[PDB]
Design an enzyme around this catalytic site. Structure first.
Site, PDB file in Angstrom:
ATOM      1  N   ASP A 454      -2.393  -3.615  -4.178  1.00  0.00           N
ATOM      2  CA  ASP A 454      -1.451  -3.584  -5.285  1.00  0.00           C
ATOM      3  C   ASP A 454      -1.572  -2.249  -6.011  1.00  0.00           C
ATOM      4  O   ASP A 454      -2.678  -1.795  -6.299  1.00  0.00           O
ATOM      5  CB  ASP A 454      -1.732  -4.740  -6.244  1.00  0.00           C
ATOM      6  CG  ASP A 454      -0.737  -4.809  -7.382  1.00  0.00           C
ATOM      7  OD1 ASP A 454       0.481  -4.885  -7.108  1.00  0.00           O
ATOM      8  OD2 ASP A 454      -1.173  -4.798  -8.553  1.00  0.00           O
ATOM      9  N   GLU A 491       1.309  -0.594  -2.009  1.00  0.00           N
ATOM     10  CA  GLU A 491       2.380   0.038  -2.770  1.00  0.00           C
ATOM     11  C   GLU A 491       1.987   1.457  -3.145  1.00  0.00           C
ATOM     12  O   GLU A 491       1.135   1.657  -4.008  1.00  0.00           O
ATOM     13  CB  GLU A 491       2.654  -0.737  -4.056  1.00  0.00           C
ATOM     14  CG  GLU A 491       3.279  -2.100  -3.876  1.00  0.00           C
ATOM     15  CD  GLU A 491       3.459  -2.813  -5.204  1.00  0.00           C
ATOM     16  OE1 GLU A 491       2.510  -2.801  -6.020  1.00  0.00           O
ATOM     17  OE2 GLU A 491       4.553  -3.372  -5.439  1.00  0.00           O
TER      18      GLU A 491
END
Ligand SMILES: OC[C@H]1O[C@@H]2O[C@H]3[C@H](O)[C@@H](O)[C@@H](O[C@H]4[C@H](O)[C@@H](O)[C@@H](O[C@H]5[C@H](O)[C@@H](O)[C@@H](O[C@H]6[C@H](O)[C@@H](O)[C@@H](O[C@H]7[C@H](O)[C@@H](O)[C@@H](O[C@H]1[C@H](O)[C@H]2O)O[C@@H]7CO)O[C@@H]6CO)O[C@@H]5CO)O[C@@H]4CO)O[C@@H]3CO
Ligand SMILES: [Ca+2]
Ligand SMILES: [Ca+2]
Length: 866
Positions: A454, A491
C-alpha cells in the site's frame, strides 16, 4: 514549555540547523527546561566549515543546505539522547534524533522474544528510553503478577528468564521523553516484534511461533502442496476482502462467517466460486489487510448490526440505508483495515477467539486451504503509516517506545500525515529493518506467496529492494518456503513530501522501472473507464461511450471527442503490450512513438516499465467505484443492463488478455455493485455485499454514505431508482461464464504471457492505427514461430499466431487486415463453445484477411499448427 524541532542530530558529532550568520546545546534528564534555563548540562557547538558529509545529505536530501555544527568529544552522546534537548542562538528549538540514533545504535541482533530449551529472552530497541521493565500477566485480563527490570546494552534493553515464561502475557513499561508533551512519561506498550496478542492488542502473548501446537495438520508439507508457478508471467490476481467473502454466505454456519475460518469451508458457495476461477486459470488471491489494525473491535460481543430485513424495504434511491449504517459504522465488524497497529500479528476480529492460538492456527489454515484449491496467497501490506502516535492510546505502539523515530516528520518536527496520518519513515534503519523483518515473518511463519504494498511510493526504494532479495533467497530446506516464487507489487504513486525524491529515492512508478517489482498501471485504467477519480464522474472513456455514445455531459465537439478516443486507444495499446517504455507503437497521428514517448494528460510517460512483470493492469479495485458502478454512471442511461453486461466483460477481458499481469477486483465477474459508493472502507456489510447465490449484485440498495458521496447523490438517485439498471440472476451468471472463458483463453496459449520486453517487441503488433483508424476498435496480433527457419523460438505448440479484436462499438465491424491474409484463422475453440450466441458469429475471411466481429464483443482468432 514545548518547543518545536527545527534542528537535526544527524551524526554522533554533527548537528544540522538552518540558521544564519554562538550556538549551544542544553540537556535536562527530568525535562525541566524553560525559556534556556533549568538545564542539567550545557555545551557550545563549533560551526563546521566543511558542511555536512555526503552520507548525511544522501540520507536526508531535504536538509543538504542546513548549516553544520560539531559536537565536542567530551560530550557523552548516549546519555544525552535520553534527556530533553534544545538548541539556542545568540531562537530556540528541539532536535530530531533519527540521524544520530542510527549512527550510534543501528542494531541487527535478536529483537522481540527468543526461546531456548532452558530459557526465554526479551529484547527491545529503545535508545532514548531512561528505563524499561516488563510487566507479566497470567492471562489476557488477569492482574499483574510480576515486574522485571531490563538492562540496556547499546540502546537495546534485554532480560532472560526461565522457560516457564512461555505463554505468559506481557507489556513493556517504557520511561521516555515525549516531544508532543515535553515530559518524561512512563507508558505501557506492546512488543513491536509481537507474534500474538490478546483481544485488541491490549497485551502481548509470549508464544513460540514454532510450537507444534500452532501448526495445522501437514503444515510443514505445504511447500510440496503449493500450486506450481513456472514464471511470474503466469500470474493473475483476484483482490478479496476477508469479511466480504463470507459475511453473507448462508452455506457457512452463522458463527464461522466473516473471518479466517470461513475459508476452511471447502464446499461453501464462496469457496466453490474461488475454485471455479482457480480451475479457469486464476493463480493468486490478494487479501485485504489481515494484520492487527484499528477500526474493528476484536470482542464480538461489542459488535452492532443494522436490520438487514428492514433496510431491504426502503426505496432503492433512499438515504435511509446509509443513515442507518453510518449510525453504527464505528462499532460494526467491518473495515478494510488500512490502519496499522502491529504488522506481524493476525487480526483478532477475524479469529474465532481473540485470546489464544486460534488467530495463528486459523490464519495458516486459510493459507493452506487456498493453496489446496490452486490459489497462492498475497497479503496487503501497509508499511506507509500508523493508526496512532503519541504516549496515550492502546492503538499506539511504535511511537510510544521511540518517540519521533518511526514516524516521518516535517522540517518543524511535526508529524507527516500524507499517507493518511502518522506517516512512517522507512528511510530510518530500524524502520527499514522492521519492515523487512515483518515480511520475512509472514513468508516463513505463515508461508505467504506474495505482497502488495500500500502506497509503495511512500517507501524507500532501497527498503523495497533489500526486502526483495531477502524474500527471494528463502529456500525450502532452510525455511520451508520457496522464496524464488514470491512476488511483489504495489501502488507506485508519487506525491506529497516524498515526491521528486525529496526524502530519498522512493518506490514510485518511475523509480521502480527495472526492479522486477510490479506497479499498478493507472494509465490503462483511466483510458478504459474515462477521466479519473478526481475528475467529473461523467467523463467518458474508451469503454464507456466516449464519442461513440455521448452521455450528455459536454466534452467537446465530435472532432475533439473522436481525437480523445484515439488518444485513449493509444494508451490502452501501450498497456496491453506490458506498458513498456521502449515498445514502438504507431500512434493516432500516424507517427511512430515509444511507450515512454507518449505522455499522460499531465506530461509524464505512459509506458514506463522495463518488463511486463512490472506492470499490473486493471480497471477496478477495492477503492473508488466498482467496475459495474462506474459503467452505469458513465454510459448513457438509455442503455439496457444487457448491453452494460457486455461492456463489463469488455473491460475485464482487456485485462485478462493483456501482456503483463492482469488484476481483478472481486466481483468483476458477477457485476458486483456498492450502489455507487466510491470509498466503501467504512460502509459496512450492507454496501459491500458479495452475493454468491447470484440473486443480486447489491445495486439499488439506497444512496451511499453521505460522507464521501453526498455531492454526487443527485447523479446516483435517478440511476439507483431506475429498475432497468438492476441486473437479474441470468445476467450475473452470464457475466461469470464469459469471464471464466476469457481466463481459459489467457491460459490456453503462452503467447498472451510473454516474459520479456524483447519478446513483446518482436511478436506483439497492433493493426488498427493511424489518423484513419476505425474508432472503437483494437486489433492485437501476437506472432509465433512459423514455417521453417524462424527467427523466433516456437513458444506455442498449438497455434502459430493469435489475433484479438476488441470491439466497443455498438455495431458489428469488419476489419480488413491484409498482413493477415491467406492464413488459417479460426474462432477460438473456447468461443466456439461459448454460451454467448453473439461471439459465436465471429468470422474470418482469408482472401482479404477480413475479421468480422459483433458489437460490444471481444473475439479471439487463432491459427492452428496441426
Ligand atoms: O491523497 C488525497 C486523496 O486521498 C484519497 O484519494 C485516493 C484515491 O481514491 C486513489 O484512487 C488513489 O489515487 C491515485 C490515483 O489512482 C493515481 O492516478 C494518481 O493520481 C494522479 C492524478 O492522475 C492526477 O490528476 C493528479 O492528481 C491531482 C489532482 O489534479 C488534484 O485534483 C488534487 O487531488 C486532490 C483531490 O482533488 C482531493 O479530493 C483529495 O483527494 C483525496 C481523496 O479524498 C481520497 O479519495 O486530495 C487530492 C490531493 O491534493 O491533487 C492531485 C495531486 O496533486 O496527480 C495524481 C498523483 O500524481 O495518484 C493518486 C494518489 O495520489 O490514491 C489516493 C490517495 O490514497
Ligand atoms: Ca489455479
Ligand atoms: Ca466500521
Amino acid at each position: 514549555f514545548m518547543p518545536d524541532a527545527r534542528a537535526y542530530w544527524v551524526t554522533s558529532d554533527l548537528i544540522a540547523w538552518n540558521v544564519g550568520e554562538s550556538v549551544c546545546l542544553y540537556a535536562s534528564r527530568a525535562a525541566a527546561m524553560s525559556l534556556i534555563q533549568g538545564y542539567d548540562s550545557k555545551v557550545e557547538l563549533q560551526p563546521e566549515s566543511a558542511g555536512l558529509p555526503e552520507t548525511v545529505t544522501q540520507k536526508f536530501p531535504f536538509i543538504s543546505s542546513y548549516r553544520a555544527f560539531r559536537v565536542p568529544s567530551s560530550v557523552d552522546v548516549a546519555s544525552l539522547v535520553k534527556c530533553q534537548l534544545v538548541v539556542a542562538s545568540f531562537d530556540v528549538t528541539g532536535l530530531q534524533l533519527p540521524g544520530v540514533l542510527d549512527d550510534m545504535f543501528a542494531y541487527t541482533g535478536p529483537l522481540g522474544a527468543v526461546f531456548s530449551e532452558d530459557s526465554v529472552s526479551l529484547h527491545l530497541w529503545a535508545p532514548t528510553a531512561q528505563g524499561v521493565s516488563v510487566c507479566f500477566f497470567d492471562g489476557p485480563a488477569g492482574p499483574a503478577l510480576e515486574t522485571v527490570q531490563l538492562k540496556e546494552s547499546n540502546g537495546v534493553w534485554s532480560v532472560t528468564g526461565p522457560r516457564e515464561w512461555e505463554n505468559r502475557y506481557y507489556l513493556y513499561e517504557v520511561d521516555v521523553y515525549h516531544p508532543t508533551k515535553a515530559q518524561v512519561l512512563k507508558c505501557l506498550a506492546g512488543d513491536p516484534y509481537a507474534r500474538s496478542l490478546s483481544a485488541n492488542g491490549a497485551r502481548t502473548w509470549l508464544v513460540d511461533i514454532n510450537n507444534e501446537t500452532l501448526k495445522p495438520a501437514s503444515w510443514d508439507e505445504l511447500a510440496d502442496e503449493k500450486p506450481k508457478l513456472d514464471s511470474f508471467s503466469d500470474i493473475t490476481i483476484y483482490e478479496l476482502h476477508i469479511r466480504d467473502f463470507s459475511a453473507h454466505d448462508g452455506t457457512v454456519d452463522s458463527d464461522s462467517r466473516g473471518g479466517f475460518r470461513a475459508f476452511a469451508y471447502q464446499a461453501s458457495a464462496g469457496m466453490e466460486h474461488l475454485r471455479k476461477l482457480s480451475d479457469a486459470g486464476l493463480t493468486h488471491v490478494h487479501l485485504l489487510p489481515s494484520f492487527h489494525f484499528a477500526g474493528v473491535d476484536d470482542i464480538k460481543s461489542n459488535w452492532k448490526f443494522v436490520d438487514e430485513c428492514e433496510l431491504a424495504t426502503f426505496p432503492p434511491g433512499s438515504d435511509m440505508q446509509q443513515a442507518a449504517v453510518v449510525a453504527i459504522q464505528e462499532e460494526d465488524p467491518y473495515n478494510w483495515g488500512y490502519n496499522p497497529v502491529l504488522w506481524g500479528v493476525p487480526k483478532g476480529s477475524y479469529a474465532s477467539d481473540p485470546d489464544g492460538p486460534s488467530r495463528i492456527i486459523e490464519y495458516r489454515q486459510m493459507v493452506q486451504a487456498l493453496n489446496r484449491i490452486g490459489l497462492r496467497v498475497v497479503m496487503d501490506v501497509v508499511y506507509n503509516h500508523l493508526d496512532s502516535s503519541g504516549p496515550c492510546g492502546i492503538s499506539s505502539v511504535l511511537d510510544k517506545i521511540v518517540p519521533g523515530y518511526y514516524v516521518r516528520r516535517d522540517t518543524n518536527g511535526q508529524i507527516e500525515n500524507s499517507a493518511a496520518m502518522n506517516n512512517t519513515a522507512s528511510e530510518h534503519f530500524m524502520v527499514d529493518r522492521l519492515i523487512v523483518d515483518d515480511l520475512l515473518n509472514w513468508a516463513v511463519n505463515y508461508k505467504v506467496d506474495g505482497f502488495r504494498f500500500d502506497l509503495m511510493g511512500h517507501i524507500m526504494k532501497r527498503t523495497m529492494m533489500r526486502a526483495k532479495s531477502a524474500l527471494q533467497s528463502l529456500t525450502t530446506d532452510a525455511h520451508g518456503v520457496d522464496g524464488s516464487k514470491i512476488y511483489l507489487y504495489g501502488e507506485g504513486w508519487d506525491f506529497a513530501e516524498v515526491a521528486r525524491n525529496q526524502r530519498g529515492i522512493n518506490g514510485s512508478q518511475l523509480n521502480m522501472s527495472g526492479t522486477g517489482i510490479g506497479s499498478f498501471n493507472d494509465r490503462i485504467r483511466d483510458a478504459i473507464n474515462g477521466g479519473n477519480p478526481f475528475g467529473n464522474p461523467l467523463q467518458q472513456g474508451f469503454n464507456t461511450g466516449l464519442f461513440l455514445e455521448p452521455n450528455g455531459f459536454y466534452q467537446g465537439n465530435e472532432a475533439d471527442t473522436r481525437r480523445s478516443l484515439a488518444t485513449y486507444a493509444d494508451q490502452i495499446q501501450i498497456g496491453l503490450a506490458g506498458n513498456l517504455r521502449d515498445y514502438v507503437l504507431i500512434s493516432h497521428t500516424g507517427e511512430a512513438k515509444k511507450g515512454s514517448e507518449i505522455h499522460t494528460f499531465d506530461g509524464l510517460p505512459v509506458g514506463y516499465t522495463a518488463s511486463p512483470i512490472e506492470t499490473i493492469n486493471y480497471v477496478s479495485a477495492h477503492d473508488n467505484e466498482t467496475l459495474f458502478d462506474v459503467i452505469s454512471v458513465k454510459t448513457p442511461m438509455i442503455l439496457s443492463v444487457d448491453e452494460r453486461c457486455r461492456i463489463n466483460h469488455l473491460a475485464s477481458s482487456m485485462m485478462a488478455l493483456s501482456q503483463g499481469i492482469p488484476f481483478f477486483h472481486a466481483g468483476d465477474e458477477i457485476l458486483r455493485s456498492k450502489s455507487i459508493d466510491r470509498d466503501s472502507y467504512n460502509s459496512g456489510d450492507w454496501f459491500n455485499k458479495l452475493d454468491f447465490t447470484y440473486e443480486t449484485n447489491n445495486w439499488g440498495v439506497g444512496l451511499p454514505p453521505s460522507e464521501k458521496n453526498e455531492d454526487n447523490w443527485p447523479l446516483m438517485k435517478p440511476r439507483l431508482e431506475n429498475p432497468s439498471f438492476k441486473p437479474a440472476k441470468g445476467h450475473i451468471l452470464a457475466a461469470l461464464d464469459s469471464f471464466v472463458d476469457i481466463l481459459k483463453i489467457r491460459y490456453s496459449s503462452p503467447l498472451f504471457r510473454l516474459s520479456t520486453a524483447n519478446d513483446i517487441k518482436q511478436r506483439v503488433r497492433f493493426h488498427n492505427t493511424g489518423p484513419s483508424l476505425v474508432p472503437g476498435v483494437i486489433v492485437m496480433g501476437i506472432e509465433d514461430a512459423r514455417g521453417e527457419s524462424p527467427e523466433m523460438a516456437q513458444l506455442d505448440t498449438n497455434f502459430s499466431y493469435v489475433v484479438t479484436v476488441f470491439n466497443v462499438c455498438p455495431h458489428e465491424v469488419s476489419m480488413d487486415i491484409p498482413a493477415l491474409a491467406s492464413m488459417g484463422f479460426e474462432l477460438h475453440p473456447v468461443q466456439v463453445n461459448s454460451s454467448d450466441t453473439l461471439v459465436r458469429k465471429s468470422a474470418y475471411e482469408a482472401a482479404t484477411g477480413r475479421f468480422t466481429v459483433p458489437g460490444r464483443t471481444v473475439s479471439v482468432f487463432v491459427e492452428p499448427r496441426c
